[PDB]
Amino acid sequence: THSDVWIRQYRPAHPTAPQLICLPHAGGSATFYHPVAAALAPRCDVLAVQYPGRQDRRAEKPLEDIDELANQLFPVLRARVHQPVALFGHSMGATLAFELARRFESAGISLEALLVSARPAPSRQRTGGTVHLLSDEELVAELRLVRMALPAIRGDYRAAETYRYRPGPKLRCPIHALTGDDDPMVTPVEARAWSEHTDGPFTLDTFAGGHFYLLEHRDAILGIIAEHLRTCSR
């Protein structure tokens, strides 16, 4: 395997393998996607992104803006990208995945799919989130070693909550949205609105659960991912 500071490749992949770039949620690390790597490789090259400020990057100042995360991450992913390539993001990672998709397409790099989980459409971003503004003590409480990780969690939340969608050209790549049926942070319309951001095909799948439904539906989501990349799951 070959990994850098940003992009963690947990398993070896065939040279023919399609690429899956996985964006963690707020407070998440690249290790969150180890089950995806294990289940799809070597038939899929699973690349998991490690944002600054966590684990081995704890010394780095955490980023506070999705566009800054994307702008810094895109050149790195550019040097590794190999089509066919797909993106998967959960929660805040879904917005980052969408922003990265916008940048791939503007660079003439087609995407096999954009998979977005538990996140309103960029055009339906909820304004007025304040979790990132809570005191250290009020922060940890609402999140229910943590102080070492809190600056990175706060920065991630700040990025999720202060995101401002700037209108631009629609995507052309397929968008597959995935949501829980009991998620106070994503309404059905908010999830369906992802259809308004691509001229390609759109599909929305709902699962029994909340914001982290995907922990209970891993095998199902892996089969959905594999279907998009023309592979099988383990």
What is the residue extent of each domain of the chain? 7-229
Give the technique used to solve this structure. Answer: X-ray
Distance of CA 222 to the CA centre of its chain: 15
Phi/psi at 176 (5° precision): -120, 115
Gyration radius of the chain over CA positions: 17
Asked whether the beta carbons of 159 and 53 are under 8 A apart, the reply is no
Q: Which residue in 53, 58, 73 sits closest to 155, CA to CA?
A: 53
CATH code of the domain made up of 7-229: 3.40.50.1820
φ and ψ at 202, to 5 degrees? -125, 140
Any idea what DSSP says for residue 182?
A: T
Nearest-CA neighbor of 229 among 7, 10, 6, 16? Answer: 16
Identified catalytic residue from 29, 91, 117, 233:
91
Torsion of CA 78, 110, 204, 129, to 10 degrees: 40
- 157 Cβ neighbours under 8 A, 6+ residues apart: 26, 27, 92, 129, 131, 132
Which H or E run contains 176? strand 175-180
User: Does the active-site annotation cover 29?
Assistant: no
* Distance from C-alpha of 83 to C-alpha of 5, rounded to nearest angstrom: 22
DSSP state of 200: S
Element (H, E) at 87: strand 85-90
Q: What is the resolution of this structure in A?
A: 1.9
